[PDB]
Amino acid sequence: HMNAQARFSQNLLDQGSHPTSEKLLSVLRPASGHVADALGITEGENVIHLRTLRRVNGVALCLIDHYFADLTLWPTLQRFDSGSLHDFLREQTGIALRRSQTRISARRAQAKECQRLEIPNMSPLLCVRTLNHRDGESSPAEYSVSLTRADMIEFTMEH
Amino acid sequence: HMNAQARFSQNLLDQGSHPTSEKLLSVLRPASGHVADALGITEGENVIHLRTLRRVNGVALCLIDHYFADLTLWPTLQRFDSGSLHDFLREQTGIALRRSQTRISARRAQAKECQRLEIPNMSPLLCVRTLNHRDGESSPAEYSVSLTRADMIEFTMEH
Ligand SMILES: OC[C@@]1(O)OC[C@@H](O)[C@@H](O)[C@@H]1O
């Protein structure tokens, strides 16, 4: 057994659709070049953007930006409030998202990140970026960018 | 497809060390409390410790400490020089280690971490800690702790 070196342990596969998560924003907005590339779409074309935040005992720990290319999902995703985003989508539409690719990196918090995660400038973040496809195939339905306070959470994975 | 946030990408599920990794040390040594817990052995009993490092043009990128419980691997492991340590072990003994658990954290380098990875105080590191098993058994075979400069490497995983 490996002991935990951070206060909280989070399963990597569960982290993007956590059940204590709260929606902070749900808007239609033009796709940045980086969002457009992940989704396989055109820069500046509208995407659904939801931002969610989870706290533990008040303390913001994980902020996630979720981008979907399928605007048919808008009347559904705008009604998400709190809880597991993917569970919400699945009950509403029967669409079950599964992960295709994950990227994990660490960087110093800059700018709007410090503000939204409520942390001092340059505090380390773990950044987990995932492409999810419908239980089906290989056109990503969701690109999510999660930023977690590295001083509070360690990710775990069982194989 | 996702852009890369770092100069180099390493597969999170790749076992052992990079094909250009060099051995820094192979020794028998008493297990520390963390190492003994991971390997499910008594603190203080000997383990084989190998340390490897990947550099690019002299710049240290990825340091891994690998700790094996089976001392009978010593004739093999003391002979490792460079390359993929898991490929070397497999070529020499037939043992192909498989992962049971992974923990990923991030932290700011200090003291001996800054010395070994040749980086400034507080430089962000990704720390990846894994337990690996010979096909089947309760006893893990190997506990490894990777420390990688987060300004130079991002991890990827295909699902
Ligand atoms: O970042 C906000 C804060 O409340 O988070 C928990 C602790 O790290 C406190 O130092 C810190 O001010």
PDB file of C-alpha atoms in Angstrom, chain B:
ATOM      1  CA  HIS B   1      -6.900  15.712 -30.516  1.00  0.00           C
ATOM      2  CA  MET B   2      -5.326  17.601 -27.562  1.00  0.00           C
ATOM      3  CA  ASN B   3      -2.403  19.955 -27.839  1.00  0.00           C
ATOM      4  CA  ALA B   4       0.627  19.213 -25.598  1.00  0.00           C
ATOM      5  CA  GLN B   5       1.289  21.556 -22.587  1.00  0.00           C
ATOM      6  CA  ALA B   6       4.910  20.488 -22.332  1.00  0.00           C
ATOM      7  CA  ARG B   7       7.972  19.944 -24.497  1.00  0.00           C
ATOM      8  CA  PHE B   8       7.917  16.118 -24.099  1.00  0.00           C
ATOM      9  CA  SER B   9       5.018  13.527 -23.659  1.00  0.00           C
ATOM     10  CA  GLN B  10       5.397  10.272 -21.675  1.00  0.00           C
ATOM     11  CA  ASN B  11       2.806   7.485 -21.585  1.00  0.00           C
ATOM     12  CA  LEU B  12       1.533   7.153 -18.019  1.00  0.00           C
ATOM     13  CA  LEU B  13       1.056   3.422 -18.519  1.00  0.00           C
ATOM     14  CA  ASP B  14       4.609   2.848 -19.906  1.00  0.00           C
ATOM     15  CA  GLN B  15       6.366   0.611 -17.368  1.00  0.00           C
ATOM     16  CA  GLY B  16       9.773   1.309 -15.764  1.00  0.00           C
ATOM     17  CA  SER B  17      12.209   3.850 -17.248  1.00  0.00           C
ATOM     18  CA  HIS B  18      12.732   5.539 -20.745  1.00  0.00           C
ATOM     19  CA  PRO B  19      14.883   3.666 -23.457  1.00  0.00           C
ATOM     20  CA  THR B  20      17.573   6.364 -23.019  1.00  0.00           C
ATOM     21  CA  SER B  21      17.463   6.289 -19.178  1.00  0.00           C
ATOM     22  CA  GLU B  22      20.782   5.804 -17.389  1.00  0.00           C
ATOM     23  CA  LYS B  23      21.425   3.955 -14.135  1.00  0.00           C
ATOM     24  CA  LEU B  24      22.611   6.203 -11.370  1.00  0.00           C
ATOM     25  CA  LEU B  25      22.877   3.518  -8.708  1.00  0.00           C
ATOM     26  CA  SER B  26      22.043  -0.161  -8.001  1.00  0.00           C
ATOM     27  CA  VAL B  27      22.454  -1.119  -4.338  1.00  0.00           C
ATOM     28  CA  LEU B  28      21.025  -3.266  -1.615  1.00  0.00           C
ATOM     29  CA  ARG B  29      19.701  -1.120   1.181  1.00  0.00           C
ATOM     30  CA  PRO B  30      17.270  -1.168   4.131  1.00  0.00           C
ATOM     31  CA  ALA B  31      13.645  -0.296   3.248  1.00  0.00           C
ATOM     32  CA  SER B  32      12.388   3.036   4.597  1.00  0.00           C
ATOM     33  CA  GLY B  33       8.928   3.130   6.155  1.00  0.00           C
ATOM     34  CA  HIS B  34       7.254   4.314   2.889  1.00  0.00           C
ATOM     35  CA  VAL B  35       9.117   1.770   0.800  1.00  0.00           C
ATOM     36  CA  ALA B  36       8.382  -1.113   3.229  1.00  0.00           C
ATOM     37  CA  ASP B  37       4.653  -0.141   3.310  1.00  0.00           C
ATOM     38  CA  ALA B  38       4.437  -0.066  -0.395  1.00  0.00           C
ATOM     39  CA  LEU B  39       6.196  -3.480  -0.849  1.00  0.00           C
ATOM     40  CA  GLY B  40       4.285  -4.947   2.117  1.00  0.00           C
ATOM     41  CA  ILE B  41       7.520  -5.834   4.004  1.00  0.00           C
ATOM     42  CA  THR B  42       9.040  -4.910   7.352  1.00  0.00           C
ATOM     43  CA  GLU B  43      10.706  -1.526   7.684  1.00  0.00           C
ATOM     44  CA  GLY B  44      14.472  -2.065   7.699  1.00  0.00           C
ATOM     45  CA  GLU B  45      14.782  -5.309   5.684  1.00  0.00           C
ATOM     46  CA  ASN B  46      16.942  -4.966   2.541  1.00  0.00           C
ATOM     47  CA  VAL B  47      15.444  -4.209  -0.856  1.00  0.00           C
ATOM     48  CA  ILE B  48      17.222  -3.674  -4.223  1.00  0.00           C
ATOM     49  CA  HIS B  49      17.229   0.042  -5.004  1.00  0.00           C
ATOM     50  CA  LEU B  50      17.954   1.185  -8.582  1.00  0.00           C
ATOM     51  CA  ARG B  51      17.868   4.855  -9.486  1.00  0.00           C
ATOM     52  CA  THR B  52      17.598   5.960 -13.142  1.00  0.00           C
ATOM     53  CA  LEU B  53      17.611   9.334 -14.819  1.00  0.00           C
ATOM     54  CA  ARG B  54      16.612  10.590 -18.300  1.00  0.00           C
ATOM     55  CA  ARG B  55      18.507  13.687 -19.581  1.00  0.00           C
ATOM     56  CA  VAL B  56      18.276  15.592 -22.851  1.00  0.00           C
ATOM     57  CA  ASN B  57      21.398  17.555 -23.871  1.00  0.00           C
ATOM     58  CA  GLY B  58      22.594  17.225 -20.316  1.00  0.00           C
ATOM     59  CA  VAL B  59      19.363  18.581 -18.749  1.00  0.00           C
ATOM     60  CA  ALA B  60      17.874  16.208 -16.182  1.00  0.00           C
ATOM     61  CA  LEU B  61      14.205  15.541 -16.886  1.00  0.00           C
ATOM     62  CA  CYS B  62      12.956  12.446 -15.103  1.00  0.00           C
ATOM     63  CA  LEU B  63      14.469  10.724 -12.054  1.00  0.00           C
ATOM     64  CA  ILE B  64      12.983   7.352 -10.869  1.00  0.00           C
ATOM     65  CA  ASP B  65      13.774   5.372  -7.716  1.00  0.00           C
ATOM     66  CA  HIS B  66      12.813   1.709  -8.189  1.00  0.00           C
ATOM     67  CA  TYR B  67      12.717  -0.583  -5.089  1.00  0.00           C
ATOM     68  CA  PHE B  68      12.388  -4.386  -5.573  1.00  0.00           C
ATOM     69  CA  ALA B  69      11.506  -6.830  -2.737  1.00  0.00           C
ATOM     70  CA  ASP B  70      12.923 -10.012  -4.294  1.00  0.00           C
ATOM     71  CA  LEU B  71      16.623 -10.088  -3.470  1.00  0.00           C
ATOM     72  CA  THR B  72      17.098 -12.994  -5.810  1.00  0.00           C
ATOM     73  CA  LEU B  73      16.819 -10.505  -8.597  1.00  0.00           C
ATOM     74  CA  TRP B  74      20.145  -9.037  -7.568  1.00  0.00           C
ATOM     75  CA  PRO B  75      22.338 -11.015 -10.085  1.00  0.00           C
ATOM     76  CA  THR B  76      20.173  -9.470 -12.812  1.00  0.00           C
ATOM     77  CA  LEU B  77      19.501  -5.958 -11.571  1.00  0.00           C
ATOM     78  CA  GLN B  78      23.071  -5.150 -10.524  1.00  0.00           C
ATOM     79  CA  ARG B  79      23.961  -5.665 -14.234  1.00  0.00           C
ATOM     80  CA  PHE B  80      21.521  -3.031 -15.547  1.00  0.00           C
ATOM     81  CA  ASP B  81      23.397  -0.178 -17.256  1.00  0.00           C
ATOM     82  CA  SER B  82      20.997   1.892 -19.385  1.00  0.00           C
ATOM     83  CA  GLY B  83      17.825   1.678 -21.332  1.00  0.00           C
ATOM     84  CA  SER B  84      14.386   0.601 -20.387  1.00  0.00           C
ATOM     85  CA  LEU B  85      14.761  -1.146 -16.949  1.00  0.00           C
ATOM     86  CA  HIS B  86      11.490  -3.126 -17.434  1.00  0.00           C
ATOM     87  CA  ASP B  87      12.590  -4.295 -20.907  1.00  0.00           C
ATOM     88  CA  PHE B  88      15.986  -5.311 -19.425  1.00  0.00           C
ATOM     89  CA  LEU B  89      14.333  -7.269 -16.581  1.00  0.00           C
ATOM     90  CA  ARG B  90      11.971  -8.964 -19.077  1.00  0.00           C
ATOM     91  CA  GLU B  91      14.741  -9.828 -21.540  1.00  0.00           C
ATOM     92  CA  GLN B  92      16.881 -11.254 -18.786  1.00  0.00           C
ATOM     93  CA  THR B  93      14.308 -13.146 -16.653  1.00  0.00           C
ATOM     94  CA  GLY B  94      10.988 -13.251 -18.552  1.00  0.00           C
ATOM     95  CA  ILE B  95       9.295 -11.192 -15.760  1.00  0.00           C
ATOM     96  CA  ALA B  96       6.902  -8.554 -17.219  1.00  0.00           C
ATOM     97  CA  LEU B  97       5.646  -6.403 -14.452  1.00  0.00           C
ATOM     98  CA  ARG B  98       2.040  -5.231 -14.452  1.00  0.00           C
ATOM     99  CA  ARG B  99       0.727  -2.208 -12.611  1.00  0.00           C
ATOM    100  CA  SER B 100      -1.711  -2.471  -9.736  1.00  0.00           C
ATOM    101  CA  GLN B 101      -1.912   1.035  -8.444  1.00  0.00           C
ATOM    102  CA  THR B 102      -0.742   4.522  -9.554  1.00  0.00           C
ATOM    103  CA  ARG B 103      -0.703   7.739  -7.454  1.00  0.00           C
ATOM    104  CA  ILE B 104      -0.019  11.083  -9.219  1.00  0.00           C
ATOM    105  CA  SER B 105       0.779  14.260  -7.304  1.00  0.00           C
ATOM    106  CA  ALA B 106       2.541  17.591  -7.895  1.00  0.00           C
ATOM    107  CA  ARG B 107       4.781  19.507  -5.629  1.00  0.00           C
ATOM    108  CA  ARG B 108       7.427  22.177  -5.468  1.00  0.00           C
ATOM    109  CA  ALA B 109      10.975  20.789  -5.406  1.00  0.00           C
ATOM    110  CA  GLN B 110      13.173  21.246  -2.386  1.00  0.00           C
ATOM    111  CA  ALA B 111      16.512  20.081  -0.972  1.00  0.00           C
ATOM    112  CA  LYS B 112      17.640  16.757  -2.380  1.00  0.00           C
ATOM    113  CA  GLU B 113      14.987  16.844  -5.141  1.00  0.00           C
ATOM    114  CA  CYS B 114      16.532  20.128  -6.409  1.00  0.00           C
ATOM    115  CA  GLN B 115      19.983  18.520  -6.142  1.00  0.00           C
ATOM    116  CA  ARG B 116      19.183  15.361  -8.060  1.00  0.00           C
ATOM    117  CA  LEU B 117      17.052  17.039 -10.772  1.00  0.00           C
ATOM    118  CA  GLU B 118      19.402  20.032 -10.878  1.00  0.00           C
ATOM    119  CA  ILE B 119      16.592  22.632 -10.585  1.00  0.00           C
ATOM    120  CA  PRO B 120      15.878  25.760  -8.557  1.00  0.00           C
ATOM    121  CA  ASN B 121      14.184  25.846  -5.265  1.00  0.00           C
ATOM    122  CA  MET B 122      10.345  25.473  -5.571  1.00  0.00           C
ATOM    123  CA  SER B 123      10.425  24.264  -9.213  1.00  0.00           C
ATOM    124  CA  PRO B 124       7.147  22.279  -9.852  1.00  0.00           C
ATOM    125  CA  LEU B 125       7.550  18.475 -10.180  1.00  0.00           C
ATOM    126  CA  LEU B 126       5.090  15.716 -11.156  1.00  0.00           C
ATOM    127  CA  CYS B 127       5.469  12.776  -8.822  1.00  0.00           C
ATOM    128  CA  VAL B 128       4.180   9.385 -10.123  1.00  0.00           C
ATOM    129  CA  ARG B 129       4.304   6.442  -7.690  1.00  0.00           C
ATOM    130  CA  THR B 130       3.439   2.959  -8.844  1.00  0.00           C
ATOM    131  CA  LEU B 131       3.093  -0.602  -7.448  1.00  0.00           C
ATOM    132  CA  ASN B 132       3.874  -3.355  -9.938  1.00  0.00           C
ATOM    133  CA  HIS B 133       3.342  -7.118  -9.664  1.00  0.00           C
ATOM    134  CA  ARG B 134       4.526 -10.282 -11.346  1.00  0.00           C
ATOM    135  CA  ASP B 135       1.437 -11.766 -12.937  1.00  0.00           C
ATOM    136  CA  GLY B 136      -0.988 -12.527 -10.103  1.00  0.00           C
ATOM    137  CA  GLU B 137       0.436 -12.195  -6.642  1.00  0.00           C
ATOM    138  CA  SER B 138      -0.389 -10.277  -3.465  1.00  0.00           C
ATOM    139  CA  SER B 139       3.231  -9.197  -2.795  1.00  0.00           C
ATOM    140  CA  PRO B 140       4.055  -6.308  -5.128  1.00  0.00           C
ATOM    141  CA  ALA B 141       7.345  -6.908  -6.949  1.00  0.00           C
ATOM    142  CA  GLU B 142       8.403  -3.272  -7.339  1.00  0.00           C
ATOM    143  CA  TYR B 143       7.547   0.196  -5.970  1.00  0.00           C
ATOM    144  CA  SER B 144       8.754   3.126  -8.090  1.00  0.00           C
ATOM    145  CA  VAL B 145       8.680   6.838  -7.506  1.00  0.00           C
ATOM    146  CA  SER B 146       9.209   9.077 -10.551  1.00  0.00           C
ATOM    147  CA  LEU B 147       9.939  12.812 -10.201  1.00  0.00           C
ATOM    148  CA  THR B 148       9.663  14.736 -13.472  1.00  0.00           C
ATOM    149  CA  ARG B 149      10.159  18.387 -14.210  1.00  0.00           C
ATOM    150  CA  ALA B 150       6.665  19.578 -14.892  1.00  0.00           C
ATOM    151  CA  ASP B 151       7.949  22.333 -17.142  1.00  0.00           C
ATOM    152  CA  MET B 152       9.236  19.673 -19.608  1.00  0.00           C
ATOM    153  CA  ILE B 153       7.018  16.571 -19.442  1.00  0.00           C
ATOM    154  CA  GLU B 154       3.238  15.905 -19.635  1.00  0.00           C
ATOM    155  CA  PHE B 155       1.755  12.416 -19.174  1.00  0.00           C
ATOM    156  CA  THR B 156      -0.691  10.864 -21.579  1.00  0.00           C
ATOM    157  CA  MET B 157      -3.000   7.866 -21.309  1.00  0.00           C
ATOM    158  CA  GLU B 158      -5.068   6.103 -23.986  1.00  0.00           C
ATOM    159  CA  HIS B 159      -8.182   4.379 -22.913  1.00  0.00           C
TER     160      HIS B 159
END
